Design a protein around this ligand. Structure first.
Ligand SMILES: [Mg+2]
Ligand SMILES: [Mg+2]
Ligand SMILES: [Zn+2]
Ligand SMILES: [Zn+2]
Ligand SMILES: [Zn+2]
Lengths: 112, 269, 168, 96, 170, 559, 87
RNA sequence: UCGAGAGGA
DNA sequence: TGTACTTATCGGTAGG
DNA sequence: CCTACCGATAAGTACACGATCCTCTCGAA
């Protein structure tokens, strides 16, 4: 019920001036803040303090603070995120990079 | 903050809105699973209007002299009269149409009919009447079994989630609901002949063009969605030039959460 | 990972490398036993692989006796592989001069005789490669035996190896 | 010209994963570094003429992998080593 | 002694993406593998069975057009051990000792690792090692026990001894 | 690429594990000793002493050297060294973590304060987290200030059983800068009457307690068995970053101009050399601790110089030293400034202009900009005649080339080169050619707020130096032409340019997914004139009616 | 842990080619053509390698196979021929 | 080049 | 300007 | 009817954050 009220409040500010933004965008942000258990702040201590790969988190304010926690607690960055593949300098698993492409020898002969 | 909070979020290949770690935020993107660009503000005619006009515009009664279809609309309009087997499905059609009005009034309690939904049926029928040059003088080539069955057979083809088990099949039915409610509203057995005058050749084309435009309107796996949403909410906030708190100072409270006054005026009824 | 202990020293107490296990894996997936070869076994395997190589190299082109084995192997090494391979010529030179059995028929019985007794494929690769006369000679040069095989039962095999022994 | 966070953000939104990566590497930093596959650090002493690739600390001339990563990342992991932090770069998967 | 092992290895340029690819890749495999000498596997001598080679699929790399193919193959290996008794042929004969060409690897035996009752003969060419009626010259097949192994470059070397029962000249 | 071929496998970084440097591994990892705190000259003649800078690591001035591996500045990755600290010291980052681990595990034995038998202890250890589990473990062992020997009385009938070693009283610990102090109570009608006893807790005491901590006490407090052992939170052996991390810069030729860290690294060696000689020579008891606090402070401000509101440390002149934390801190500092966002090549920027005769997807690039930016085209049988004709035109005639890359990595600068006029051009070679018409290129206007503002644009090479663009595309970018500038990015690969034309095209981005409606509209004169024209009042005579029709590029030819 | 790939039967993925796949398959085929790779379709005097890759898809003569990964690691290998180009 | 200062939609 | 972390005094609960 | 302990709500102190890009010039100990 809390998230349903949260959407009403977010949508009411977008409606106040500048109608409109599609339900999909605000309901995603709202579902992000509530698919946690309670309410999640969109700040350095709210969302940024989560079970996320250390490199993704250090790129938002608490940089060396989080990187010290990463080493002291022996955290492992999964390399599955957007941010950690940008730092590594690899084709990130986003749209074009979310699938791999192989060549088929069965098809190579078929077409000559 | 918004853009950094929703970087990881992306529509996966199994129509589910997950992230980097793999936690689920939404099971179907924005509840319907459509690429936001292929949507138009469409009107649901089953929710709006009086019960007298709704019963007049949609109720089909072959077992009556004044509530039947005139043979100038149907090719077989006189041999379809007094048919009990054909009225069984025309009762089944109107019993689903009266269910739609009661369910829609539960969803949109405010009474508004114009809502954004995929596939512009409004124009798909407007172009069919021009593409085939259909005249209002001569009767159609289709019958009642062709309309009421063809409309229901199309509803199966409109796939969002690729099913096999009880969960995915029920999630598929839940995903369409509001769209097929509009489809039942627009392709009613009476409406197809009374207002549109669709020939069997042009009707089969309209059903396929609806299926084709719907499968085009489905979200593309790889769409960054969260990144898209983060910018789609943050951009209008930049142009907030226009005694309760509103605009950007109120927008900080809704992000911060944030147990301070400003204007906590609760509403009692 | 993180240096590791290293394992153990490579010895003649069947303490083979951390890679060469008594029971290892296959490309297909099965748990196949270790494939160790002696000087007769390894000579007939490279000759077989290079005889079948020229057959495949010339398919695409479309659209016995001691000293006679030395010259025929030397020609085969030049056609199938280029001059760049120095190691293979020295090995094939050494394998044909020190092979115990020349005929593929005799080798089959040698492997059936040895790979059956209950000995590691490396001990078999060492028995079939080195010529031994006394039971004690084999027990000293291949120290992995001792308890693994009986002194008189090992002599029974050693006698049969002199009968299986080929003429040069 | 600068291709910062705001410029990277839109290229993710579009879905062009390789154009963003090319802008980030081929048109900017891009550096090939040898890493020890056993520990995951840049401990490798790569001689590209005598071929003595040896990693002092793991006695290995076999488990060594070269990688194209940005020169600033190489530099960042070296700064983290200077602060007693170990960003062990592993090319092998172990968590599904 | 010599083993047959199941082991694997390749990035292929897009200009070679034609029907004559499977055979061209098989050549790229033997071009590097055939002749190589790894520290863990030993000398890679001959890639067995040129036919039936498993190649699977080549994932075309991110920004370049090259295909990364995994080539599963079978090849003969020459891997020695510290204790492995080997009978090669004497190739180098000198005052210090002798070098034994056991297949593709050279093994060195010092004057101290061999018996004290033998000694080198300088007044005989090719250089020789006498005792009674046993002489070690330019050829002379010898039985050596590998006491130690040297990994060095892509060419394994050893340090064997011939001072024991049943050892020496053969 | 980092130049030159390598005979090693190339494989993507699939995961990155974090941990701490073991002072035992830092000794094996190290190639340097770092005894001398001086940097430039031999002793002291010319080119770096074998103490700090190139003892057996990174090269310096155009010399390949690099501990015999050579390779040169552009290839040499820099090698790590080690510096032995006379007395162990805390790590600035793990100050509260060391203090909170001491507040949980009791001292004198190195064993947990509460272990298994307590019901709340089982309720806190129930979570298999890392920090959330340790968060409860801190609040539980924070109190119950004495270690225990015998404790269960209401689980076994009455008698109590022993699970611990020594029952010594754990003290209350607080922070007074770089050091920690514990308050032992006692005072039960015995020593110190009623006031407690306070002790300065040295790193040598804490480290030996952390060494005696059990293998299960690591997992209970959020530590790893091989990556992050609590003993490595205290530094006994410090690693030294090579020259690529702290360069010499080179002031002219015979001058210096070293990096802020090279001076700071020597300052830790200077603070350590005073203790190294004091511990061996005349020891004045409470005068070595006065210097030990300065070595602790030197290693502290090297990593963190923007510490608590007590010390500062500045490298005279008055400007303060930039620490490793301040160097890679957010906003224009390594993570956000050199990794999340970077400066790029094959880019342009100039004042923008509007045009009614440009296509919606077109961009008017000036001749000087297209002649400066290059696209590397590979020599194929489909170009050859075209590619050689551009090489023939050279770097001054508009459709021309600047550099020709041959079979091996050898750039041929056509601006100079004795053979510029000749050039045969073989297949497989790369020819860097001037930008030409209808080339997919990214055109951008900062701030980049939404998915748009960064779109693909068909190129049209035009005179008059200014970025020309269509009028209707003023809305997605938001900018007008009141002295506004715009970026430009030429893609270098055939794949990235196909990822721009088949994804980010200007007309492909006509309908906005934000408001499910279009994000491009007819504006200004085109919107003002369309109302004036579209009304029953106005008609157009035959003469102007045929020019109105010819202006339409897809006109059928039917009046 | 073992494999995770579901066969070319019983697949829960879209039979249509995603806009990102279309741009990638063209991008890589146009790159390979530009790098001298052998062209399978009959050339009609095409000097641009993307114009070639675009026709290559129309005739369905591309020998590429797409590996569509799911969140649990499982993948379904879809050959370019199997996928339908609506978009 | 560091820093400060100034200036631009 | 707001959040989060950390320590000191304080009324009562019921058990021997 | 009193005490060994055990939860209250306090108030104080401490935390490193805040448009995007771009351009020009001055003066070090
Ligand atoms: Mg994680
Ligand atoms: Mg402006
Ligand atoms: Zn290592
Ligand atoms: Zn170097
Ligand atoms: Zn204790």
């Amino acid at each position: 019920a809390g998230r349903a009220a949260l959407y009403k409040e977010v949508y009411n500010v977008i409606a106040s001036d500048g109608s409109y933004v599609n339900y999909r965008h605000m309901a995603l942000l709202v579902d992000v803040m509530t698919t946690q258990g309670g309410l999640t702040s969109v700040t350095r201590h709210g969302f940024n303090r989560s079970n996320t790969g250390a490199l993704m988190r250090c790129s938002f304010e608490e940089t060396v603070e989080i990187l010290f926690e990463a080493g002291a607690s022996a955290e492992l960055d999964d390399c599955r995120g957007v941010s950690e593949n940008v730092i590594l300098g690899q084709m990130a698993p986003i749209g074009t990079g979310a699938f791999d492409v192989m060549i088929d020898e069965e098809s190579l002969v078929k077409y000559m | 903050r918004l853009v950094k909070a929703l970087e990881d979020i992306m529509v996966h290949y199994d129509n589910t809105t997950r992230n980097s770690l793999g936690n689920v935020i939404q099971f179907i993107y924005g509840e319907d699973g459509m690429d936001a660009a292929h949507i138009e503000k469409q009107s649901l005619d089953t929710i709006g209007g009086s019960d007298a006009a709704f019963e007049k515009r949609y109720r089909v009664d072959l077992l009556n002299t004044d509530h039947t279809l005139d043979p100038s609309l149907l090719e077989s309009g006189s041999e379809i009269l007094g048919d009990l087997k054909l009225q069984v499905l025309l009762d089944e059609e109107y019993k689903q149409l009266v269910k739609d009005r009661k369910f829609l009034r539960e969803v949109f309690v405010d009474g508004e009919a114009n809502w954004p939904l995929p596939v512009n049926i409004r124009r798909i029928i407007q172009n069919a009447q021009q593409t085939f040059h259909i005249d209002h003088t001569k009767p159609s080539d289709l019958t009642i079994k062709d309309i009421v069955l063809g409309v229901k057979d199309l509803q199966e083809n409109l796939l969002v989630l690729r099913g096999k088990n009880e969960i995915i099949q029920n999630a598929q039915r839940d995903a369409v609901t509001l769209f097929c409610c509009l489809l039942r509203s627009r392709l009613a057995t009476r409406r197809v002949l009374q207002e549109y005058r669709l020939t069997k050749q042009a009707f089969d084309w309209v059903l396929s063009n609806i299926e084709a435009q719907f499968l085009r309107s489905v979200v593309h796996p790889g769409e960054m969605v969260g990144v898209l949403a983060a910018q789609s909410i943050g951009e209008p906030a930049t142009q907030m030039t226009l005694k309760v708190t509103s605009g950007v100072p109120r927008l900080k409270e809704i992000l911060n959460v944030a147990k301070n006054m400003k204007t906590p005026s609760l509403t009692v009824y | 990972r993180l240096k590791k202990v290293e394992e153990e020293e490579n010895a003649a107490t069947l303490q083979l490398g951390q890679e060469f296990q008594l029971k290892q894996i296959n490309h297909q997936g099965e748990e196949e036993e270790l494939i160790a070869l002696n000087l007769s076994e390894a000579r007939l395997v490279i000759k077989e692989a290079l005889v079948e190589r020229r057959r495949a190299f010339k398919r695409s082109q479309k659209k016995e006796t001691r000293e006679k084995e030395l010259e025929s192997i030397d020609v085969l090494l030049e056609q199938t592989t280029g001059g760049n391979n120095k190691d293979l010529k020295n090995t094939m030179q050494y394998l044909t001069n020190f092979s115990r059995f020349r005929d593929q028929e005799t080798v089959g019985a040698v492997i059936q005789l040895l790979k059956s007794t209950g000995l590691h494929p490396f001990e078999v690769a060492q028995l079939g490669s080195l010529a031994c006369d006394t039971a004690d000679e084999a027990k000293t040069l291949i120290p992995s035996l001792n308890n693994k095989i009986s002194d008189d039962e090992l002599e029974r095999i050693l006698k049969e190896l002199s009968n299986l022994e080929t003429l040069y | 010209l600068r291709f910062g966070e705001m410029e990277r953000d839109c290229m993710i939104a579009h879905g062009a994963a390789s154009f963003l990566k090319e802008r980030l590497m081929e048109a900017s930093d891009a550096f090939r570094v040898h890493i020890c596959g056993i520990c995951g650090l840049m401990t490798v002493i790569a001689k590209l003429n005598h071929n003595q690739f040896e990693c002092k600390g793991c006695d290995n001339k076999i488990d060594i992998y070269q990688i194209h990563i940005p020169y600033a990342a190489k530099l960042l992991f070296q700064e983290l080593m200077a602060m007693n932090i170990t960003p062990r770069l592993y090319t092998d998967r172990s968590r599904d | 002694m010599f083993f047959i092992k199941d082991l694997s290895l390749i990035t292929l340029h897009p200009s070679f993406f034609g029907p004559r690819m499977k055979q061209y890749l098989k050549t790229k495999l033997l071009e590097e593998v055939e002749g190589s000498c790894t520290g863990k596997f030993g000398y890679i001598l001959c890639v067995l069975d040129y036919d039936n080679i498993d190649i699977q699929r080549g994932r075309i790399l991110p920004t370049d057009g090259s295909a990364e193919f995994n080539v599963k193959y079978r090849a003969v290996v020459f891997k020695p051990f510290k204790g492995e008794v080997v009978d090669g042929t004497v190739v180098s004969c000198s005052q210090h000792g002798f070098e034994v060409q056991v297949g593709p690897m050279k093994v060195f035996v010092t004057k101290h690792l061999m018996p004290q009752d033998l000694t080198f003969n300088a007044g005989s060419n090719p250089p020789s090692y006498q005792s009674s009626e046993d002489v070690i010259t330019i050829k002379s097949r010898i039985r050596v026990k590998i006491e130690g192994c040297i990994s060095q470059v892509s060419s394994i070397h050893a340090i064997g001894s011939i001072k024991e029962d049943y050892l020496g000249a053969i | 690429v980092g130049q030159q071929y390598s005979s090693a496998p190339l494989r993507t970084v699939k995961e990155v594990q974090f941990g701490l440097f073991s002072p035992e591994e830092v000794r094996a990892i190290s190639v340097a000793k770092i005894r001398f705190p001086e940097t430039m000259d031999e002793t002291q003649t010319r080119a770096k002493i074998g103490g700090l800078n190139d003892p057996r690591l990174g090269s310096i001035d155009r010399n390949l050297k690099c501990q015999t591996c050579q390779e040169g500045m552009n290839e040499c990755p820099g090698h790590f060294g080690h510096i032995d600290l006379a007395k162990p010291v805390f790590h600035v980052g793990f100050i509260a973590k060391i203090k909170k681990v001491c507040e949980c595990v009791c001292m004198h034995c190195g064993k947990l304060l509460l272990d298994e038998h307590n019901e709340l202890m089982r309720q806190a250890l129930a979570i298999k987290d890392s920090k959330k589990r340790f968060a409860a473990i801190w609040t539980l062992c924070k109190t119950k200030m004495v270690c225990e020997t015998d404790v269960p009385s209401e689980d076994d009938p009455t008698q109590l059983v022993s699970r611990g070693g020594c029952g010594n009283t754990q003290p209350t610990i607080r922070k007074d800068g770089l050091k920690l102090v514990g308050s032992w109570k006692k005072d039960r009608a015995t020593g110190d009457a009623d006031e407690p006893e306070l002790r300065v807790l040295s790193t040598e005491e804490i480290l030996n307690i952390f060494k005696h901590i059990s293998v299960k006490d690591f997992t209970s407090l959020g530590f790893n068995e091989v990556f992050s052992r609590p003993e490595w939170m205290i530094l006994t052996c410090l690693p030294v970053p090579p020259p690529p991390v702290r360069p010499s810069i080179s002031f002219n030729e015979s001058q210096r101009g070293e990096d802020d860290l090279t001076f700071k690294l020597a300052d830790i060696l200077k603070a350590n050399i005073s203790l190294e000689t004091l511990e061996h020579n005349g020891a004045p008891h409470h005068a070595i601790e006065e210097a030990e606090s300065l070595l602790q402070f030197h290693v502290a401000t090297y990593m963190d110089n923007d510490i608590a509101g007590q010390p500062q440390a500045l490298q005279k002149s008055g400007r303060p030293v930039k620490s490793i934390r301040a160097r890679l801190k957010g906003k224009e500092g390594r993570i956000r400034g050199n990794l999340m966002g970077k400066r790029v090549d094959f880019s342009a920027r100039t004042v923008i202009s509007g045009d009614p005769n440009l296509e919606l997807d077109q961009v008017g690039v000036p001749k000087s900009i297209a002649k400066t930016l290059t696209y590397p085209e590979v020599v194929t049988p489909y170009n050859i005649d075209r590619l050689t004709q551009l090489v023939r035109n050279g770097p001054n005639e508009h459709p021309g080339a600047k550099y020709v890359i041959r079979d091996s990595g050898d750039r041929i600068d056509l601006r100079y080169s004795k053979r510029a006029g000749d050039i045969q051009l073989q297949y497989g070679w790369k020819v860097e050619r001037h930008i030409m018409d209808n080339d997919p290129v990214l055109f951008n206007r900062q701030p980049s707020l939404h998915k748009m503002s960064m779109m693909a644009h068909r190129v049209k090479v035009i005179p008059y130096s200014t970025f020309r663009l269509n009028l209707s595309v003023t809305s997605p970018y938001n900018a007008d032409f009141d002295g506004d500038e715009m970026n430009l990015h030429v893609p270098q690969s055939e794949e990235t340019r196909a990822e721009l034309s088949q994804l980010c095209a200007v007309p492909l981005q006509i309908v906005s997914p934000q408001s499910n409606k279009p994000c491009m509209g007819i504006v200004q004169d085109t919107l003002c004139g369309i109302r004036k024209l579209t009304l029953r009042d106005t008609f157009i005579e035959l003469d102007q009616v045929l020019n109105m029709l010819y202006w339409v590029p897809d006109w059928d030819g039917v009046i | 842990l073992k494999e995770k790939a579901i066969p070319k039967d019983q697949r829960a993925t879209t039979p249509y080619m995603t806009k990102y796949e279309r741009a990638r398959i063209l991008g890589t085929r146009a790159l390979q053509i530009s790098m001298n790779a052998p062209v399978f379709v009959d050339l009609e005097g095409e000097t641009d390698p993307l114009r070639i890759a675009m026709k290559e898809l129309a005739e369905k003569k591309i020998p590429l196979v797409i590996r569509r990964y799911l969140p649990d690691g499982s993948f379904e290998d879809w050959s370019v021929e199997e996928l339908i180009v609506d978009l």
